Write a protein that binds this ligand. Structure first.
Ligand SMILES: [As]
Ligand SMILES: [Zn+2]
Length: 193
């Protein structure tokens, strides 16, 4: 099971999010209280990368999903039988992968040869001039448990910064729920606090 320990490392790596609120028209919203993102299926999901020093060119950023619940944590997170079979290919992402990146032609997808786990990687790019952070647009393509089934575990996204040789530079994470009405579900989960 991949590590989920937060690790800022030598470049001072951490994540930032937009403050989008919970209006009905919102397609993507982050709960600071829950450290949890609520997303419509396949909609743009901005995640910000913040560093204290700029990692070198060739640095890469990987996203991997795991199941939070102990009884399901060794299971590979992948799309349910419905979403796997959807004609929603962008010609890059394998159809089983839950997490995609949009708007990046250098995106790379991995089926791990040893663990079988899926991940998606892009090149780390520094903030543009006069910007304080780098944004990656994720798309989540399934909530895993869309059709039911034993596994109702929350899903955690782990974001790792790695160098061009695969050395871990930094790590962070957030929970994610893909749903039709993200604003409503955020409000409801926060009420349960
Ligand atoms: As989102
Ligand atoms: Zn699904």
């Amino acid at each position: 099971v991949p590590s989920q320990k937060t690790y800022q490392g030598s470049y001072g790596f951490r994540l930032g999010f937009l403050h989008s609120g919970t209006a009905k028209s919102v397609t993507c919203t982050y709960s600071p209280a829950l450290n949890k993102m609520f997303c419509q299926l396949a909609k743009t999901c901005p995640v910000q990368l913040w560093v204290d020093s700029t990692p070198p060119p060739g640095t890469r950023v990987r996203a991997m999903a795991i199941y939070k619940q102990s009884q399901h944590m060794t299971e590979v997170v992948r799309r349910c039988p419905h979403h796997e079979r959807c004609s929603d290919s962008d010609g890059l992402a394998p159809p089983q992968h839950l997490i995609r990146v949009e708007g990046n032609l250098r995106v790379e997808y991995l089926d791990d040869r040893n663990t079988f786990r899926h991940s998606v990687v892009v090149p780390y790019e520094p903030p543009e001039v006069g910007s304080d952070c780098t944004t990656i647009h994720y798309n989540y393509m399934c909530n895993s448990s869309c059709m039911g089934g034993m596994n109702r575990s929350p899903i955690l996204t782990i974001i790792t910064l790695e160098d061009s040789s695969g050395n871990l530079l930094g790590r962070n994470s957030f929970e994610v729920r893909v749903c039709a009405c993200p604003g409503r579900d955020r409000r409801t989960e926060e009420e349960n606090l």
